[PDB]
Write an enzyme that holds these catalytic residues in place. Structure first.
Site, PDB file in Angstrom:
ATOM      1  N   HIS C  81       0.824  -1.198   0.000  1.00 46.03           N
ATOM      2  CA  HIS C  81       0.000   0.000   0.000  1.00 46.03           C
ATOM      3  C   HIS C  81       0.864   1.255   0.000  1.00 46.03           C
ATOM      4  O   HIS C  81       1.715   1.407   0.885  1.00 46.03           O
ATOM      5  CB  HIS C  81      -0.967   0.025   1.181  1.00 46.03           C
ATOM      6  CG  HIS C  81      -1.950   1.149   1.111  1.00 46.03           C
ATOM      7  ND1 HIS C  81      -2.779   1.339   0.026  1.00 46.03           N
ATOM      8  CD2 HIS C  81      -2.224   2.154   1.973  1.00 46.03           C
ATOM      9  CE1 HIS C  81      -3.524   2.412   0.227  1.00 46.03           C
ATOM     10  NE2 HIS C  81      -3.208   2.922   1.403  1.00 46.03           N
ATOM     11  N   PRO C 168      16.456   7.855   8.723  1.00 45.77           N
ATOM     12  CA  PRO C 168      16.431   6.477   8.227  1.00 45.77           C
ATOM     13  C   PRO C 168      15.141   5.692   8.532  1.00 45.77           C
ATOM     14  O   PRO C 168      14.564   5.078   7.629  1.00 45.77           O
ATOM     15  CB  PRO C 168      17.624   5.837   8.944  1.00 45.77           C
ATOM     16  CG  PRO C 168      17.971   6.741  10.073  1.00 45.77           C
ATOM     17  CD  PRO C 168      17.645   8.099   9.565  1.00 45.77           C
ATOM     18  N   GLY C 171       9.722   8.521   7.526  1.00 44.02           N
ATOM     19  CA  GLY C 171       9.500   8.897   6.133  1.00 44.02           C
ATOM     20  C   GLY C 171       8.491  10.010   5.942  1.00 44.02           C
ATOM     21  O   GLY C 171       7.658   9.947   5.042  1.00 44.02           O
TER      22      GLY C 171
END
Lengths: 540, 540, 540
Positions: C81, C168, C171
């Site tokens: 998704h 890292p 997002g």
């Protein structure tokens, strides 16, 4: 197949040991299946429900009476329901295949063998009772338990079976046969008084005597669910064939739109016969102008149309009789073991599956193909101009398809019966000329299935022919195979008839069948062609 | 299908946590199946065995090395078996379909990707190694563990993969590919000295140098089971194709009848390939002059002939690789869902099963019928004069039958690949002219199956023809259907080829296939006739 | 009261420890209630749903982000998704009372306090985002996870909150506020192609660009339930106020009766706001011309009309938000402790319940009586000629009744706030002149409730008057008490206003309220009379 429902009305006593003990002896009777045991404490009775073959059920019927015999004293029984015996009414109803007249004879059986094996007064009622005063069950219940202390000794109240004697721990019993009865409730968002009005207007007895209601053989009243705060037009369909399950609903519907009260669905109470709600289905398609091919889906419709799941969900897999107890027979069908199994089976040293069988299956493959192109040419816009036609012809194929798939069985049954004859003693005049006689009746069946297989495939021809005209086009191939498969279907059918007619004596039947079969083969031969023609000449 | 065995030789530190941890990481690799983990305490190693597709196994191969990497220190390792690394030999063998040359390339893959992802010395061996000094595994094992402290730094012993570096907790690793190796023991009721004599005489290396034994590529020795008091000629078939599983047995057999010692069966140790013992089977029929139709039964024979159950029973369902891990593929076959399912499926709005498929099944029904009459005319005295003929032709039908049953799959695969192409992006030159290119290769297959389906049914004709001559007679019907079914089989086959060839470009291939197909249809048309003729003219 | 829904879209690493840990930190935040955690393995995300007060929810919102912060590495995340961050969208929607503009400010809060307490890129979307390119959520999802390696460093893609930095194990994250969205499916007994046709015709985007569908702010498609064999017009109501829950259904309904396909009910997916299906209800009464008084019953109707229980039952007690989390407040109501409790409570040394409260209850007893005679004159044939009138006036009484019953609370709240002021430090200019200022705003409320209590009872007068004309008659008594009770209700109301206005400064407001109140008392005095008159003069 050959299903009869049997609902013994047991005078509960009220206490597990009595219930579950009866409910076993009835369920440890071979040939019937126990479908539900409804018990009601304040009514102090337990209705048991179970189905099965004509003679099988009767066992359970009387297998259950001899266990309650030595488990209930009516002397210490007193329920808030107009009981009479320890087994009040014990009726015997049709479900599929068995007709009234049989159910009337089951009643004759139980009634005799019972009053005999016990020594108790038993009168047969309903579609049974000969004396035109006893068909009404409440009339016989001549003021329940305390009656026999005067009533089993009256030239008037002479029992139809059983002495005239009185037993302390028993209170007479009544066998009989009626039509199948459905409990139907209609959910009104109204008031108990109103709901009851509506009901008086539907029910056949109507408001008092003179001036019946609208629906015939629908009896019922107004009622109110306490915990839901919801009123109910509670009814009994006395015969779902005369007045339907929807014509009740759809009627209460009007009834209520005459008084501006919402109807909020319904509930079926207990078990229902497939037809009852399957006719219903067909009604909403007839009138809503639709196309609902697959059977499950027709149940899905006829739920939603009557909001059958409004008080709880409606599990048809568990509410419908014909689904609760399917009609298998002895040993399993090949129909149920994998394709690989079937193929690598006919070709066993099997005298068993084979010929007449692969005939049927190739033919059922045949129909199903035509069915599938029908559907392949259906739905999806673009084919719109053909929806009317696709709707007309997808069915016969689909329905014939399954019907031929079922001939796989037929065939196996036939053979096994033919085999049962062959393996039959012989020799002395009484059983050589009678062994012979049954073998002929053997082949009879053996013949009749392929013959059907032909007859049936032979109807699809014209629709196949038309389907071949239009009918997608990208399934050209699939139609060609289809045409060719139905053809060899009939070939198989043909051969298989002949080879049996060989051992047939009865030249009339013979000569006639011989000829009927060949024409059909011939028709198959030619018909199959033009189909194939059309298709070829279609290739555009 | 496409089976590769892979037997990592793990330097078992000896302790569950190490074993079962490796044995998971290998079994949690998608595309391979873990077949057995043999561990030996006093040898202090654990051989793992697992099969699967070419690239899939390599994952497990290196998926298992990275888990043993961080779980074994060779510094505290010392087993009573000439080890070297933490993963000594890790070979890659064919099982079905995959050829040596592939197994040689898998070795190329594991070897590279391994010494890379770890930093360790790895040399490929066997059918791999290029340097003609390394094909022998014991030569590389240059005195095991303590070797790399001098040997991974010699212009001579330069690793075929991996730096030249030394790791404390590792000790080099050796990939490669060999032929499949079977462990075979021969039970002698003799003495260890004698048994070992026999063995020297069979084994290829023979008594010392000059003067080999009899069997080529069989190595082995004399051995003695302690608890059974039973001696053994213990051997390794290095290639069951050159020297067979029986030619060992049957030879030790002579070997012993030369010294008057009884041989009392045998045992296979570990896993065996189907062919190995299936050729064996065919041997004892060739020479014992028999007829053993069904495969299982052939295993049953080739057990008993080698007394393979003498030390314990031989469960072929659990000893044979091709049975342990069958060759399904993605999603199940229709071959495995009930006849009803199959019929009431093709005729679904299924573009999916249909046409080309019912073609195949009608044809497989066809063969199987002919097979069945063959067997129906077999055994039972009376048909004796035909046993020789029945034995000759029952098979081709039976074997073709199953082969066509398997085209059901083929068909479904073809279609799904054709579909995979169609559903393929488009438009930009790189992937329109390459999407197109694969779609053609699509149809290619789509065509090839029906075509096979024809070709294959087209061979049965003459045997069908002869079976039709004699061949019971009470199955007349069954043969007629049979003839007719194979016919329409080829019809289906025919159409289905054409309709695909339509979208084919490559007129040569086309025009040629077009014509081949039709002839076959034609042949089907005529051949089917006389069969039917013969049968009719047989009607005596 | 003051309900805000909040649906954090969590990038489910997929593994209990992550889910149930987030799902606690969110549920161990005081002032919000966790309503459902939907997780989807193949989507590899977990949608969490929870409601509560404006600032309370924001805690849970960011209380959940700081727990997922230290529990998810996006580096090892890859779901089927279009994700982006570890918390993709985190929107804030109204449920009751709170308006868009507030939900826009909650978004302002979470967005700031989040990117601050973490150091991550966050842009607000929807009814939030100022830049007219960001209101569309899929536009921001600029190709998911791998984007920030170039996009969080573009004068174009400058985050609305949070540096420009890359983490890292994160997002980016997107806050915002939209309207409440409902998942609605429409059950078609059709085919997926057809169903999807229907859907294109309803949905607003329509068949491509130019040429929208019919319903505005309804988006959706054609879909097919696999296990049920049932097609679906699956939709999202983007705003149940513009296009209603029924106007979708009732429209798909026509859509399908245009193509002769049955619609077989529907399902709501997830949680629904009371209004959505409560307007729906009112629709079917408006148009079906009915009278459904009690609220539950209105849900019962608007179920059955949309067949909302067709795929599973619809438990409104567990599907509706306003029922899942009722609007109590702090400490329980007296409304909920027994009549005895209430009486033997006001008369406690309670300064607490009393006067203004018994005013309210006597008044609510008042209305409810009139309501009851209305219903006592309803249903039952005989009163038919009055059904039209009864339907017109039973409600206002019934609805006012409950509304005054609810003033019991109001009163208690007022008092406690008045008390809160009084108990307020004092003395230094900053908090004497500001303590004073709040106390006045205290009385303000204290006054406003009785005043409402008058106003509200003052509307029932004319209907009471007319109900008094006809309206059973056997409840004469009950109406007389009713009249009298509402009267003293207003008396209570009157006094209670005065005594507060005493400490009021603001003579305008005062003098005005003083007078309004008295007129109402007066009106009460006179009106109550003639009611009583009529009734007396009715005494026939």
């Amino acid at each position: 197949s050959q299903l009869v429902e049997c609902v013994p009305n047991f005078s509960e006593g009220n206490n597990q040991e009595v219930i579950d003990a009866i409910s076993q002896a009835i369920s440890q009777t071979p040939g019937c299946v126990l479908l539900d045991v409804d018990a009601g404490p304040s009514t102090n009775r337990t209705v048991y429900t179970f189905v099965g073959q004509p003679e099988c059920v009767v066992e359970g019927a009387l297998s259950a009476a001899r266990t309650a015999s030595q488990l209930i004293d009516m002397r210490k029984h007193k329920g808030e329901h107009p009981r009479m015996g320890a087994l009040d009414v014990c009726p015997f109803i049709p479900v599929r295949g068995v007709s009234m007249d049989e159910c009337v004879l089951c009643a004759k059986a139980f009634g005799q063998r019972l009053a005999e094996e016990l020594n108790v007064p038993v009168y047969l009622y309903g579609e049974a009772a000969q004396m035109p005063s006893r068909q009404t069950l409440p009339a016989i219940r001549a003021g329940e338990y305390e009656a026999l202390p005067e009533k089993l000794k009256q030239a008037e109240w002479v029992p139809d079976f059983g002495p005239s004697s009185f037993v302390p721990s028993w209170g007479a019993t009544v066998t009989g046969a009626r039509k199948f009865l459905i409990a139907f409730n209609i959910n009104l968002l109204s008031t108990k008084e109103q709901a009851h009005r509506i009901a008086l207007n539907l029910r056949e007895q109507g408001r008092g005597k003179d001036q019946p209601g609208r629906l015939k053989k629908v009896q019922g009243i107004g009622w109110y669910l306490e915990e839901k705060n919801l009123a109910q037009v509670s009814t009994n369909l006395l015969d779902f064939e005369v007045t339907a399950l929807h014509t009740v609903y759809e009627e209460a519907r009007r009834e209520a739109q005459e008084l501006n009260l919402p109807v909020v669905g319904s509930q079926l109470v207990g078990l229902v016969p497939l037809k009852a709600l399957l006719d219903a289905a067909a009604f909403y398609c007839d009138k809503e102008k639709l196309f609902v091919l697959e059977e499950e889906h027709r149940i899905r419709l006829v739920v939603n149309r009557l909001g059958l799941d409004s008080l709880a969900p409606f599990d048809p897999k568990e509410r419908i009789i014909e689904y609760l107890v399917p009609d298998s027979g002895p040993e399993q069908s090949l129909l149920d073991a994998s394709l690989r199994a079937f193929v690598r089976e006919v070709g066993a040293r099997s005298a068993a599956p084979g010929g007449g069988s692969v005939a049927a299956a190739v033919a059922a493959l045949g129909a199903a193909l035509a069915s599938m192109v029908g559907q392949m040419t259906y739905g999806r816009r673009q084919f719109d101009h053909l929806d009317s036609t696709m709707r007309r012809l997808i069915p016969p194929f689909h329905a014939a398809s399954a019907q031929l798939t079922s001939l796989v069985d037929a065939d196996a049954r036939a053979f096994a019966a033919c085999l049962g004859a062959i393996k039959l003693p012989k020799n002395t005049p009484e059983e050589r000329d009678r062994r012979t006689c049954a073998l002929q009746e053997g082949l009879r069946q053996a013949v009749a299935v392929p013959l059907k297989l032909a007859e049936t495939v032979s109807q699809l021809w014209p629709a196949l022919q038309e389907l071949a005209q239009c009918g997608n086009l990208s399934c050209l191939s699939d139609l060609q195979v289809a045409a060719k498969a139905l053809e060899t279907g009939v070939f198989g059918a043909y051969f298989n008839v002949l080879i049996n007619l060989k051992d047939m004596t009865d030249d009339v039947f013979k000569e006639k069948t011989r000829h009927r079969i060949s024409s059909l083969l011939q028709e198959a031969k030619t018909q199959a062609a033009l189909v194939l023609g059309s298709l070829e000449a279609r290739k555009e």
